């Protein structure tokens, strides 16, 4: 179902939580290698995830689930938000700079974080 299909996108989003937790940890101990490796695997999982959610969005466009189509289309604008966020942070990465890297993590986080009640209204919703 949707809601099976809901719930392999949130294991997928917790993924990049735990993948990204380690990368601040390597950032913050300098571990520059690491970090490009980790940079890299949370560009694939945030591609799958985007992936997953847009799926899940058509799907509940076409049930007529007009709740779940509402939290879904803010919800995709925050995950929007999100990945700009981490994009930028991968080009303070490339260009050296840490200001910037931290500056993008924590907000990266600031925004995952505000985005979780959604998330769970969600699964209920589908
Ligand atoms: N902030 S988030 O919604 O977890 C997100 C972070 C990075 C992405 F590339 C896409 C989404």
Same mark, same amino acid.
């Given at each position: 179902?949707?809601?099976?299909?809901?719930?392999?996108?949130?294991?997928?989003?917790?993924?990049?939580?735990?993948?990204?937790?380690?990368?601040?940890? %390597?950032?913050?101990?300098?571990?520059?290698?690491?970090?490009?490796?980790?940079?890299?695997?949370?560009?694939?999982?945030?591609?799958?995830?985007?992936?997953?959610?847009?799926?899940?969005?058509?799907?509940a466009?076409?049930?007529?689930?007009?709740?779940?189509?509402?939290?879904?289309?803010?919800?995709?604008?925050?995950?929007?938000?999100?990945?700009?966020?981490?994009?930028?942070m991968?080009?303070?990465?490339?260009?050296?700079?840490?200001?910037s890297?931290?500056?993008?993590?924590?907000?990266?986080?600031?925004?995952?974080?505000?985005?979780?009640?959604?998330?769970?209204?969600?699964?209920? %919703?589908?």
């Amino acid at each position: 179902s949707v809601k099976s299909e809901y719930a392999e996108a949130a294991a997928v989003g917790q993924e990049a939580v735990a993948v990204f937790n380690t990368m601040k940890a %390597a950032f913050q101990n300098g571990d520059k290698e690491a970090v490009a490796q980790y940079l890299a695997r949370l560009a694939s999982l945030y591609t799958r995830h985007e992936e997953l959610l847009n799926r899940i969005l058509e799907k509940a466009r076409r049930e007529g689930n007009k709740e779940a189509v509402t939290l879904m289309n803010e919800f995709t604008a925050t995950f929007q938000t999100g990945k700009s966020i981490f994009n930028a942070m991968v080009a303070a990465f490339k260009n050296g700079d840490d200001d910037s890297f931290e500056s993008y993590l924590q907000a990266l986080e600031k925004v995952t974080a505000k985005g979780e009640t959604l998330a769970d209204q969600i699964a209920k %919703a589908l």
